[PDB]
Structures are given as structure tokens and as C-alpha cells.
Amino acid sequence: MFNLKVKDLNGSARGLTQAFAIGELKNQLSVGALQLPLQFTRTFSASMTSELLWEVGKGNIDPVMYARLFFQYAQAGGALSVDELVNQFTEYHQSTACNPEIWRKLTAYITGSSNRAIKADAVGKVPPTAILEQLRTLAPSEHELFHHITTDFVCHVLSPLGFILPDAAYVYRVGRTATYPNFYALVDCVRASDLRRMLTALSSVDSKMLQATFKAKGALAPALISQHLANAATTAFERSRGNFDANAVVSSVLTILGRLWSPSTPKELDPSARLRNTNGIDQLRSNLALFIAYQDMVKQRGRAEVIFSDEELSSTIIPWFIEAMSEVSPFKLRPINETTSYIGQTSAIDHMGQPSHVVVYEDWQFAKEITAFTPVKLANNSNQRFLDVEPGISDRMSATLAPIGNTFAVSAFVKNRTAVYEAVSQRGTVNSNGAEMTLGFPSVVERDYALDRDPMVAIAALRTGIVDESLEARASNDLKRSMFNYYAAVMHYAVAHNPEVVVSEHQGVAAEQGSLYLVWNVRTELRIPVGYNAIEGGSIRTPEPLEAIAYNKPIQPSEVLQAKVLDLANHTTSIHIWPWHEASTEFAYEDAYSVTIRNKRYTAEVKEFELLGLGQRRERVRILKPTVAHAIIQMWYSWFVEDDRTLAAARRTSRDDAEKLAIDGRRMQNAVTLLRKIEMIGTTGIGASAVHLAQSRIVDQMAGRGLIDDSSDLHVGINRHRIRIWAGLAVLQMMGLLSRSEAEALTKVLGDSNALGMVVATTDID
Amino acid sequence: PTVAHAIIQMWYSWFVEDDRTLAAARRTSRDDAEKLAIDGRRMQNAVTLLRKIEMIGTTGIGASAVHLAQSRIVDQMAGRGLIDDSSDLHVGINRHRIRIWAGLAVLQMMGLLSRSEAEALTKVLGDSNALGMVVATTDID
Amino acid sequence: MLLPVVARAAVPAIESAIAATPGLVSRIAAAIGSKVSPSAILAAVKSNPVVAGLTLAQIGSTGYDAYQQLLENHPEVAEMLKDLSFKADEIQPDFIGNLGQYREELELVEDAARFVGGMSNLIRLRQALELDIKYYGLKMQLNDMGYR
Amino acid sequence: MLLPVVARAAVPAIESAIAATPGLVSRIAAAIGSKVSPSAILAAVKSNPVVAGLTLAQIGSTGYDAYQQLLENHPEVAEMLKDLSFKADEIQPDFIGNLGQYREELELVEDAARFVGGMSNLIRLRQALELDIKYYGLKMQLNDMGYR
Amino acid sequence: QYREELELVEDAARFVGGMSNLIRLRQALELDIKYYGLKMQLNDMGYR
Amino acid sequence: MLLPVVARAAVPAIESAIAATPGLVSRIAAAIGSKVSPSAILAAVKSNPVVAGLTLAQIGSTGYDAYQQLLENHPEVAEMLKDLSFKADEIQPDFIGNLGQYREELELVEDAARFVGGMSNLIRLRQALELDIKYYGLKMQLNDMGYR
Amino acid sequence: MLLPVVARAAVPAIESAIAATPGLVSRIAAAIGSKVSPSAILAAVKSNPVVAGLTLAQIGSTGYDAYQQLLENHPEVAEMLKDLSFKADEIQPDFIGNLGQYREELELVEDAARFVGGMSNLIRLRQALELDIKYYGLKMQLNDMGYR
Amino acid sequence: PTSMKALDHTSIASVAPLERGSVDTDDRNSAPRRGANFS
């Protein structure tokens, strides 16, 4: 839940406004003053995937992914950039490959034989982690991630011969990918083209010949190995040498685009008639993801320069820049319509036409799986520890959570919201303000739980636009990188549904020599503007991507957004080296169901280990967090209390008979759909076993005092409908899904509406 | 079965005689390219050894020593009042440690070796550090 | 360099402090490590934000205002500013042992907390009980009138 | 009742304290709420362990020994006894604010801790650096002789 | 004359992390001992 | 919580040292960082074992007994306690160079060791030769009688 | 490290003896090679059991039971301590020296005998080391000329 | 009794995590979180 006043966009949300992206902190942004027509038909979207555990120890090299490890190690690792990293990799690669000894000394170790041939039978086995231990001393580095890449190289040429133990295994987690390129994500993905051409040379060494000459002859010296490695590692050193600075490949090729978009480009520097006609610029001219990248470029550098020869050289840059991105990468070009598919919109209309509130939401497919691991140290004061997945705890919850899944789907939240604004609104126009725009982004709040951050700094990042410094850099680096996704994800949306876009050039405050911002042509067919613009001509031209949303008609999301859980189960043996205590929630719970029977109070305590079938309380196990599940429920809570608040706010000032009865018509109808939902959770596997026990602690507490039995014609039912409801919270409480505070207010809402009173009123006949 | 005690007594004689010479032959060389041929030879034995013993452990006499070794500790522990065992006795080390000790028992519970000879045969796996650098077990069911 | 918005307000604040007393001029010259001449440091302030911050730490009297506003102007200097400016807080000899006695006590509160709810609730509930008795009577009476 | 193993030591311990001074007899009679006569409280001690504990809290001089031994053979009373005997530890007026200044500081240690390892490691590593230089020379020399 | 010296810092820098970190880490060590005791004690009370 | 088995011995041991001289009370208050009052530190000892250990390091005269018994029932603190209590052993200026001369010599022993067997054997064999001659005669004579 | 169980056995034993007479400092420095001060020798005992066992046997009034306690509690020190302490029994004029005293010695010879070879071989080897150094050089020179 | 001593002193092959953290969490116990009141 994030609310903004679309009339004053500057103040309410500056993160999503365009005025911020191109460097206007001050309120002013130019009108539709000067313009050039354009159509964006393509975009660069990250492939749809989220982090997965990948294991580095085994002999294979999968160049695409090791590349991905560099992204994470350097970028999110706190280091400067993957660019500086890769450079320090090829100084490292030059060190070993071009050096004749370092390939002898560690083939003396693995083969055992310094000066003489080794037979075919007498071939020992040396575990992979071994040779790594020594290579550390030979070719020392400050980045362990290099030693792993060389280690499993020699493992690859020696694997057929069998000089090494297969059994050992080891594991890391690759990171999540931003869906749209930040400026630097271009620079990175260009260097990562070098790197991928590096590794594809190492990876592809068969050494079949060395396998043939070993078999027939029966023996070979280290002089055959230690050359045949040194031939491989210097084939890779070729392929690294002589590639262009990514930093100056892109910096230019985003400028010479930026000059053929902007209408005002001085003729003194005009991209020439040849490069405008270059093969491929045509396509890159119409591409969006670059544009919002360009806007970033100038936001930071403030300027641009073309170092490369304006003609002869810059026409071999582009065909090299295209081949970098176009090739399979995290970023793959797609028709623009598709990348926004999951966003959806709905609005609350006045009688005339214009919006009162208008909601924008990300659809979701609720994640119905959950896993629970127990961490196991290798030795005292060693951080290697590797977890054991425990089934039978997890089978419970995932068969418990699967019933929850069906009933919370996001579309049913907004389908509910607009049903509120129908009832609460008066009959009269809204001139008073632009229609406020509420936007659910469960992805925002989601990222706060896995990163463990106060939801208030995340929101307040979008509002004011600046990130708080008080937090440590690991968060801000994933915060800003996030806050840029939403910005981008907005404009892909706005553009997708208003194909007419027009590129101006901002120069009012003369902040930068080159600047760009779109302005949309949307045809409103409305009388009065929301936001502020002159609404002249039967179409409005609005620089802000948000306003240009508001004038859309309802849109139904065509594609469910997909969360997917991190997978521990597959590799059990491999030792986890990534910290897993960030993604782990402790699992413990206590609660008491209190009821009053014939003027006394009977309280049944209950513990979580009982609920699960465990007989004893085991401390170690830790539930791996259900973020996306806690994301949605968090949304659905805040929109529920928000609704139920706004009504009881109108319900006081209604001053009508016909309308007032329509509010209480709504609340009651709301709260007993609330409850029939929670009662539906009570029948679940944890819900069951919570009930069966709670009644049983209450019985044996009444043993001492003989008192008369109930009718249970409806009493069994009345008591039953109550005990289930308390199961409904207990299951939500014990998993992370609902915090204890909001669980209380959610009782209080269901409490005063006397929902339960009305639920039973359908089970009697009069 | 003296023919069996003969062989395994021999093997332990020669095997220890190796590592006495290598560490003797290493410190003589006083040259780097060679020292890594030797330091590759010591290690390359001490895994081939550590696998023989463990593969011995898998034998049913082997297994029955394992199962019983843990089982008595689990049940000894549950009384002490903490179950953290199940996770910990299967680990990178203590699954090897008990695996070996079951492999050296079966040799000792037979005539095949003398309890002082196994005690030294352990000390070879101590220094060669072959143990810590494997971190991977094979089960022969 | 230095952004102009910071400059219109920031430059005169320092200059005022300089004109107030010379004794500060020598101090800032030592801390920032700049030429002792008042014209020199004023040339440095404009050049780097990090430098501008350390100066405003040296003079807190008149200068505190701009400093906070500088936080807004540059995220980076403040981020690398918190580290460069630091002083070890003198610890009292008694303190750590004196804290050892409250181990027994705080664990008592947190037993009471969990029961009631968030700490905020318990602070309320504590007052409700400590509250005068008449109020319980008052509330009962409003319910007697059919108000609730 | 009271287990003999305890009672054997407990009874004469109390009786000794009584014979030492009468002033305690009146105190324990007040706390336990028993008849002031020394024969009465001694009859109560045998009857209930909870009572036996409160007495041994009133006299800590000679009595501390048995009390612990009572605590061993009775883990049951341990919880209950801990509650009945309690005193609010007087808090220093300066304390809570005085702690507020270390917020900046402790967060600095925990940044250094995580990097190194467990807090135990960092305490070691700190010493290693603070350690005299010669030692680095010493260790280098043993490696020169081929010792490891 | 500082050629010898700065190259020493940058060896220490790369190891630790960004220069900002090393400036912190330097303070952590220079810091008084009691603080190490203080932090240990809060962990003794079960505060993380 | 400090285990009673220890605490039984520990508490009076400390209290005895306090009663012996006041000069220690101020010392332990400084090291542990606790309120100087003898009642305060005694309240801290009971609370934490780690604290209890540091106290017993400050007083080694009468206290060494309990300390070891504390160490037994608490292997946990053993690591942590060993770190918090440490003193750099003063090294002699001559030492490391003085050791350099024995490089030649020790390598000579280890040549003799490997030949004979474990170091234990060589220490024996050395004595056998150093041993008086008559004994060789004695042993020969018992074999002359038939004894082996 | 020295086992804590045996630690409380040895430390009062060696200390009481040191305070009983200063003359015992002659034993510690002779064999063990501990530093001259009474405080440092104590640290050596705590450090190593072998060192400790040689502290217990040397001071014999109160020590024997304590020494035998160390043995069992840390059984690896058995072979070491029994060997590193050996005292030649001189000679008995009478024919029947027997195993009365000389038992330990005639055992000692046989080990040495076993290793080298037949009893004769050792006595031979005994002499070869007793021979003046020159004779070695002689044998080498007569080898140099090509005689063997 | 058999001696496993020698085999006991070992080191584990070290490695460095990509993203440091989660270090002091090795041993801790958080005591349970209560549910809300009910009515």
C-alpha cells in the first residue's frame, strides 16, 4: 500500500516522477513546449528468474553462470563494479598462464611425479579442494572466486584421466537480477561478454588426445601434461586481449543515440549521415530500455563525450555493441507489450467520467511451498556449516499452506477495493483534487522482509526520493537498485498503453548539455484534468508517466507474476558457504485459547511442536522464510484495515438514510466474508490439530467441577465456529505470515462488527 | 588365519616404511619443484589409505560397529537431555572419525593387526591432513 | 567540487565563525590539514563536501544549521563523514559491572511483556492499574446510562 | 517435606545462626510469617522446602552452603523460590542516558566482529596486532629452520 | 618519500575492503578494551 | 547462571579474599568493570560464570582451587575465559637469535632419532651405553645360569 | 593441557613443598630446566604433564600418591615419566643383587639389547662409541687409500 | 582403549563467503513469540 496525490506528484512521490530522473529536484518541469515524434517498439527485459543455489566445486564450467557470480561478488558484494573486477581477473589470468612454472609445480603435486613418466595403473586420487589449497600459495589473490575458477579448470582436463576424487562438493547462491538495465548494468553486461568468451575457451578443452596417448603408450611425463595445460590457459589469454573499454563502448553509443533522438541537437555536433544509416542503429533507435538508461547516464555523468572516431571507428563499435547484448545474456530483447504484462489497473469512476481513486497492482501467484532446514556446523569455530532438509515438518506446512493459497489471490483484493469506493462516495463531482492513486506493489514490501528492513524507509524512499544514510551499504545497494526497477517498470507500462510518445529536451535550468524526457499524447475524452495540465484539444500531453496512467481505462493483467522458492532439497551434501541466517526465520510459538464457561475462565495453552506432530521441542530447526507469502498477506491486511477505516470515517458523516444503510450493509458484508475465510483456514492440517487439542485442554481442566452438558444442536456449532476462528489466527501467527500486533487489531475489527454474531444467524430457522 | 595376519602385517610394515623415506627424502632435496612431487605423494597415499579403511568400515562387521557406536551415544545423550546429536554426528569430520575407528576395530577384533600398530597408523592420517581435505563419505549399504 | 545550493548558505556561516575568533582558524587548519590562511580553507570548503563537513564539526555554535542542510545536498560526504569524525565516548569504570545486576531484572520485564503484548501495551496496562479507583466507577456509570 | 540429604546440613546451619544472634529470629519470623519462637520456625523448615529457602536467604553468612545443596536436590522450588525472594536493584539516574552514547560505538564493533568471526576471534586478533614485533620475527625464524 | 608508504596502505585496503572500512576497522582496534567486554555482556543477556 | 556445585565453593572463597584485604576489591572492580562495592561484585559472580572466572584470576592465592572446579563443570567458558585473561609474556632480547645456533644441533638429534625409533627409545639407548660395564657382565652371567 | 582433576592434586603438593623449604629449587632447574623463579616453574607444571611428573617425583614427602594420580589421569605420560627418571643403582658386592633394586635396570638393558642384536653386539657397540675419535678418522683414511 | 587423538587435530579447507555476514548467530536461542489475545 502506497498512496499518492496525483495532482501534486512532485511532493507525494518523487521516485516515480520523471522530473527526478533527469535531474530536477525543484518543482519545475517543462510543458509540451518543444517536441519530436517517436515510437518505441522494443525493450531489454531480464529473463524471468530469481536466485538459485549453484554449486562451484565440481569439474564443470558453465561460463554464463560464473559470469553471474562475478556480478554478485563485485556488485552486491560492496565492491566498486564488475568492470574493475574483471580487469583484475585478466591481470590474474596473465599471471598464471603466461608463467611457465606455475603450471609445472601444481602438476608435480597432482601427478606426484616430478622427473618421470607415470604408468597407467598407479594413478592415485587427489581431492579437488586439495590442489586449491596449494594454488593459493603459488598464485595468490585477494579474491577467492578466482581460485575456484582455475581449480575447476584443471579438474576439467584431468577428469577423464582420473587423477582427482569426484566426491567432494561445494555451493554458493547466485543473486537476483534487476528486470531492466541500469546504466551500469549495460557496462557490466558488455564486460561480461569478454568474460564469457574467456571461459568458453577454458571450458572447451577436451584433452582427448592426452587421453589417447596415455592409453596406448601406457605412460606420460609431467612434460606432456604441464605443456598441455599451458597451451589451454594461453588460448584463453588470447581471447581476452584487445577488447574495448566497456565504459567507453557504451558511454559513446548511448550518446550517439542520444543525439539522434533529441530534436534540438546543435548542428555543430550532429551524428553523421553514415552512422545514422549504420546497420543496427535503426533497431537500437526505437528501443526503450536504453532510453531510460540514457536518462540515467546524463543524470550522473552530467555530460557526454565521443572519444571514438566520429565515423570510421564508431561504425565498428555498434556492431560489436549489438553482438554483446543481443547474444544470450540476462537481458534479452522483447516486444515492449510483453514485459509489463503482469501490472494491472482498475479505477473508481465518478458519474461524468474522471477517476476518484485509481489502483495499480502487481498480480501474483501465491507461493504454496515451504522448506525447513537444520543447520549443522563442521567444526567449532568454522563457518562452513551445512544444513539438512527435514521432510515431515515441511510436508505439514506445505499441505497446510496450500489451502491458504487458493483464497488470497491478489485480483480479489482490488475487485474488493473498487466495491468500497462505489459505496462510500457521495453523489457529486471530484474537482477538489486530482484523483489519488493507490498502488499495491507487493514486490516492494517483499524485498523488505528478505533484506530485513523497516517498511517505513522503503516507502519514504519513493516519496522523497533520497535514500537514508543511516542504513548500511548492503541495503542501499539493493534499495536503489530496487527503486530504479519500479521507476522503469512504470514507464514500460505507461508506454505500452500509449504508443504515442514524444521526446523533448529539458533546458530550463540548464543542468546538463544533453537531456531527454518523454511526453505522452494520451487522448482523455474528459472535461476536467486530473493532475494538472490544460486538457486542451481533447487530448492531454503529460510528462509524468503516472498521470498518463490515470487516463487509462481498466486493464486486466494477462500474466501472473511468479515467485519461486529457493531450493535446498536437491543438493544435501554440499556445504553451504552463503549466509543462510538472513533468509531463515526462527520457528517457535505459544498461545492460549481462553473461553468462559458458566462464569469462569478456562485457558488452553498450546505449543507449536505439538501442532506439528513432534513430541519434543527441537530448537535448532529454522523455517526458511515465506517472503512472498508474507508479502501478500501483509498487503491484504493493510488494505482491509484501510477499507474498514475509510467506511467508518464516512459512516459518521454520511447524513443520509439511503446511503448510511448502504455503509453498514457493506461493513457487515465485509466482516463476515472475512470470517468465513478464516474459518476456512481452521479446517487445515494445522488448523485441525490445533482445534483437537484446544478442546482437550479445556475438558480436563473442568474435571473437578461437575456441571451440565450442552444442547449442541447449534451449541456444538456455535462453540465450533468460535474455536476454528482462533485456529485461523494461530496458524497465521505461528508461521511468519501475520505479526502479533496486526493480529490483535484484526480481532478487534472482527470483534466489534460482531461478525460471529451474524455468522451463526444463518444456521438457525425462525 | 596366520596367512592373513602375515600379509596385513607386511603391508603395515612397508606402508610405514614409505612415509619414513619420503619425509626423509623431502628434507634432503632442498629444491622447490621436487618438494611438491613428494608433498603430492604423501597426500596421494593418505587418501588411498583413508579410503581403504573406510571401505572396510562399510563391511557388515564394519557397519555393525558404526550403528552401535552412534546408537549408544544417542541413547546416552537423550538422558543427558539434549538431542542435538542427530545433526552433529553426521558432519564432515565426526562421520569420518567414527568411520575409521570402526575400520580399525574390525582389524583389531580379528587377529589381523596389533592395537599399537593401528594407533600409529592413525597418526599418519593426523599429519597428512588427508582427513580434513576430503569431506565426503561413501556408503556401501 | 561543491554544489551551488550548498554555497549560498554554507559559505557565510563559516566566514562568520572565522570573523568571530581567530582561534578556530588554526584548529580547522590542523584537522582538515589545510593552509592556516582563512582564504585557503574557504577555497577548500567549496572544493570538497567531505571537507566542508569536517569544518562544520569544528564549529558547532553557528554552523549546525548548514551542516544538517549539507546532509541533504550530498549523500556521499555524510556517509564518509560519520567515520572521519569520531570520538571515543569515555566509559565509566563502574558501568559494565553495574549493568550486570540488571540481568535478573530485565528478564522479568520481558516475561511480563510477551504476556501482555508489545512493550507499548504494558506501559499502558501498568498505568491503568496505577490509575485512581474513581475512574473505574466513572466508566461503569457511563455504561449504566447506556453509553459505551 | 524436605529431603534428608539437605535437611541433614540445613537444620544445624539454621540453628547455629539462631544461637549466634536473636536479632535474626525476629526477622525470619516476619519474612516467612511464622511464630517468633525459634522452635516454631525450625518446625516449619522441615515441613516445606520453599520455606527452608527463604530462611537461608535471610541468613547468608553461614547458610549459603546448605542453600545451594538444597537447590541441587530440589530443582522444583528453584523457580518458585526465585520469585518469592526478589529485590528491585536500585538504578542509577544517569545510566539509561549514559548508555545512549554507546549506540554509535557498539555498532562499530559488530561490524568488525562479523568480518573476523565470532567475538572470541576478534579478541584474539586484536592481541595479535598489539603483540610485540619480535614475535613475528621469532615465528619467521622457526619456519626458516623448517619447523611447522 | 611517501611512495613506499602509500603502497603499504593500499595493500591493507584491498584486504579489508573499501578505504571507508579500513578507517573503521582501525578505530575498532584502537578502541578501548571495556567495550569488547560490554558487547560480550549484552550477548550474555541474550541480546543480538 | 553459575552452577551450584561451583558456587558453593566459589562464593566463600571470594568473600574470604575480600575480608583479607580491601586492596583487591578495587582491583577486581576495575578488571571486571563492576561497582566498587564488595556486595556488587559478589552479585555479579553469581550471575555470570565468565565474570566468576576473571575474579578468580585476580586472586590466585586462596582462589585457585575453586577456579579449577569451575573449569570442570564449565567447559563452555574455558575457551572464552582463556582469551579475556591474557598477558604477553616478556621475551628476552637474546632469545630468538640464541635459538638460531641450535639449528645445526637439533637436526643432528632427529637424524639419530629416526634411526633408533621414537625419541623415548633414544633416551633409553643413550643410558644403556652410558651405563656401567659390570651390568653387561651381570646380564651375561644370568644367561650363563640359564635365565633369560 | 594439564587435566583439571590432577591439577588440584599437584599444585598444592608442589607449592606446599616449595614453601616448606627453598632448597627444592635445585630439582626443578636441574632436570626440567625451568626458570629460576618459583612462579615460573609453577606455570611449567600447568603447561605440561611430563614437566609435572618430574616435579612430583622430585619432591617426595607428600608427593607419591599425587604422582600416581597424575599417571592414571593422563596415561600417555607413563612411558615418558618412568623413563626420564632413572637412577643408577651402583653395585652390590654380594652375588645376589637380584631384581630387588636392579630389576628396573636389567630390564632396561634388554630393550637396548633387543634393538641392537645379540647381547655381544651391544657391548661391542658400547665400545665403538667409547673409542677415541681419532680411531674413526683412522678407519676413514685407511679407506681413502683404498683398503677395506 | 584405542587412541583417536592424532586423527582429532585437523583443519578444514577454508573458503571465503561472497557476502559476509551471519557470523555471531552460530549459537543463540530466541525464546518463543506469543500469540494475540482472543475474544
Residue numbers in the entry:
A (entry chain B): 1 to 766
B (entry chain A): 626 to 766
C (entry chain E), D (entry chain L), F (entry chain M), G (entry chain K): 1 to 148
E (entry chain D): 101 to 148
H (entry chain C): 293 to 331
Task: Give sentences copied directly from the paper behind this entry.
We use bacteriophage φ6, a member of the Cystoviridae family, as a model system to study the assembly of a complicated multi-shelled virus. The inner T=1 shell, composed of protein P1, forms a dodecahedral polymerase complex (PC) harbouring the three viral dsRNA segments (S, M, and L), the viral polymerase P2, the hexameric packaging protein P4, and the assembly cofactor P7. The expanded PC is covered by a layer of P8, forming the outer T=13 shell. Here we present the structure of φ6 NC to near-atomic resolution using electron cryomicroscopy and single particle analysis.
The overall resolution of the icosahedrally symmetric areas of the reconstruction was 4.0 Å, as determined by Fourier shell correlation (FSC, threshold=0.143). The NC structure revealed, consistent with our earlier observations, a total of 200 P8 trimers forming the outer protein shell, following T=13laevo quasi-symmetry. Each of the 60 asymmetric units of the shell thus consists of 10 P8 chains, as the P8T trimers contribute only one chain to each asymmetric unit. The structure is α-helical and can be divided into two domains that are connected by an elongated linker: an N-terminal peripheral domain (PD; residues 1–83) is followed by a 10-residue long elongated loop (residue 84–93) and a C-terminal core domain (CD; residues 94–149). Instead of interacting with the CD of the trimer they belong to, for the majority of the P8 molecules the PDs swap between the trimers, each PD interacting with the CDs and PDs of adjacent trimers via heterotypic interactions. The presence of P4 hexamers at the five-folds provides also a rationale for the observed closed conformation of certain peripentonal P8 proteins; if the type P8Q monomers were all in the open conformation, significant clashes would occur between P8Q and P4. At the vertex distal part of this density, densities consistent with the side-chains 324-ProArgArg-326 of the P4 C terminus were identified, allowing us to specifically assign this density to the C-terminal residues 292–332 of P4. The relative rigidity of the P1A–P1B dimer interface is now explained by our observation that the C-terminal part of P4 bridges the P1A and P1B monomers whilst still allowing interdimer angles to change.
